[PDB]
Design a protein around this ligand. Sequence first.
Ligand SMILES: CC(C)(COP(=O)(O)OP(=O)(O)OC[C@H]1O[C@@H](n2cnc3c(N)ncnc32)[C@H](O)[C@@H]1OP(=O)(O)O)[C@@H](O)C(=O)NCCC(=O)NCCS
Ligand SMILES: *[C@@H]1O[C@H](CO)[C@@H](O)[C@H](O)[C@H]1NC(=O)CCCCCCCCC
Ligand SMILES: *[C@@H]1O[C@H](CO)[C@@H](O)[C@H](O)[C@H]1NC(C)=O
Ligand SMILES: *[C@H]1O[C@H](CO)[C@@H](O)[C@H](O)[C@@H]1O
Lengths: 7, 323
Amino acid sequence: XYXXXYX
Amino acid sequence: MDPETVRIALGLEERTAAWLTELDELGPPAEPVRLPRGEEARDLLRRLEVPELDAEEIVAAAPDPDRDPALWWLLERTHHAIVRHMGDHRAKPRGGPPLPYEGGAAARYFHVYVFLATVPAVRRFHAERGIPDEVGWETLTQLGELVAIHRRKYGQGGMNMQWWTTYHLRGILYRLGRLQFSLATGKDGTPHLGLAVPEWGGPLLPKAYDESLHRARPFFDRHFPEHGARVAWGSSWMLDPQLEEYLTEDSNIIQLARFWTLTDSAPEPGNADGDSSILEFVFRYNGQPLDELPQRSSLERAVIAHLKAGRHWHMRTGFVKLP
Ligand SMILES: CC(C)(COP(=O)(O)OP(=O)(O)OC[C@H]1O[C@@H](n2cnc3c(N)ncnc32)[C@H](O)[C@@H]1OP(=O)(O)O)[C@@H](O)C(=O)NCCC(=O)NCCS
Ligand SMILES: *[C@@H]1O[C@H](CO)[C@@H](O)[C@H](O)[C@H]1NC(=O)CCCCCCCCC
Ligand SMILES: *[C@@H]1O[C@H](CO)[C@@H](O)[C@H](O)[C@H]1NC(C)=O
Ligand SMILES: *[C@H]1O[C@H](CO)[C@@H](O)[C@H](O)[C@@H]1O
């Protein structure tokens, strides 16, 4: 995890 | 210039090529990019709650079309790539890559420049929707929080959460007191409000939480009447019922999570996914040794304890009906 989004 | 020149001048990785091609395709914005300078820039920065130390460095390093051609090229197209989706919550949050720090202060603060260059457009969008000025400004001040966080986390000036600021700058997320709400849509297209909790603003007191919840429906029904959400949805380490092992009944998180209805299945215990999320938000974790992290609060102790015990944290999802 550690990246964000939301897709 | 062309995508490959820009990519190479800036030291951007080869995976960014498609993005750079897409920005090339899109071209420069109709309204030319303008950066505020001097005391104009200082007033805007201060209004957006950027710490004085960073603001001063931001103004000193502001890039220039002639000396910084590759950077300027990217600045205009990145700006354009954001405004073309103004008001559009169905578009993905693409802020563009971070710039290698070998480019110096203008590279470190690149997405701050994008944000400042985009303020007039979103403020126009706010005006068109009838958003009160105080709501508009209060929403945009997360820039300051995100700048300050970069410095805490890494020790020098920057802002590397540009994917997140695409929400503020598209006019799809608003801070309404202690909580933020974004225009959002489930997999089946059903409208809801995404709920987020900014760091600045103090503890998540039940009264401040409940005032924010009361503001959501009337705000969105007035200014975005076509959206029609009845429900706020959240995904967060804060919704992990495992916190109940460690925090007391006075905990704001424990008290407030009791109103939430979780809609995801119990996670596999070996699932180590929510681990990086809780470490970011509690510690702004950046690769360092675990017993080296502070242990001042019950939550700081909790997070490490559980992880030391060989156990995992999970991001849980749920909803609350809008009052
Ligand atoms: C959201 C937030 C404001 C809530 O704080 P809070 O209201 O104080 O939460 P609680 O009342 O449950 O706090 C319980 C304990 O943990 C401590 N604590 C809470 N949040 C903490 C944090 N982010 N870092 C360190 N300690 C924290 C509290 O000081 C308290 O300590 P004590 O029992 O030793 O007195 C806070 O966690 C925060 O600012 N987080 C960053 C933003 C965030 O996580 N947002 C959600 C992203 S999905
Ligand atoms: C998502 O990440 C960005 C990047 O830093 C943050 O700025 C947001 O704050 C993050 N979102 C999160 O806050 C969701 C919280 C919803 C939880 C609802 C439970 C509230 C009651 C305990
Ligand atoms: C992320 O996007 C998804 C759907 O596209 C939505 O479920 C969720 O609420 C969004 N988060 C925010 C904060 O907008
Ligand atoms: C989620 O998937 C999207 C799909 O494009 C990626 O952009 C992102 O990096 C993450 O893996």
